[PDB]
Amino acid sequence: IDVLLGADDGSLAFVPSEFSISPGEKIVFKNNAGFPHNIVFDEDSIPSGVDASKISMSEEDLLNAKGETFEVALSNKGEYSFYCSPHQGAGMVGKVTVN
């Protein structure tokens, strides 16, 4: 599944922001508008035992240019909350359910 980082009208949002996927399905986050952006998984809001480090960008890492991607595959079932660190306050947050 492809997820846009920033909407086509410049809104600071993940498009889509809430979605479900099957285990092993790849998520391709694509830098679109209002960059820089990043994708960070909340360590307190992911399934028990999962290493946030294996699926997240560092809060200091950034996708700076249009078209840059971050790809991740999730295996453990459950809900995962994620956000864009510089735009968290603006509401650039999401949640993926692995079912």
Considering Cα of 53, then 56, then 62, then 63, what sign does the dihedral take? positive
Q: Among residues 14 and 80, whose Cβ is nearest to Cu ion?
A: 14
Q: Among residues 30 and 87, whose Cβ is nearest to Cu ion?
A: 87
Is 80 exposed, middle or buried (CB count within 10 Å of its CB: 0-12, 13-18, 19+)? buried
Question: Is the distance from CB of 66 to CB of 44 less than 8 angstroms?
Answer: no
**51 contact partners, CB below 8 Å, separation of at least 6:** none
**Subset of residues 11 to 50 that bind Cu ion, contact rule: CB under 5 A:** 37
Confirm whether 18 is a catalytic residue: no
Confirm whether 92 is a catalytic residue: yes
Q: Among residues 40 and 55, whose Cβ is nearest to Cu ion?
A: 40
* Position closest to Cu ion via CB: 84
Confirm whether 57 is a catalytic residue: no
CA 20 to chain centre: 13
Number of residues that bind Cu ion (CB under 5 A): 4
Binding residues: 37, 84, 87, 92
Residues with catalytic roles: 37, 84, 87, 92
Binding residues for Cu cation: 37, 84, 87, 92
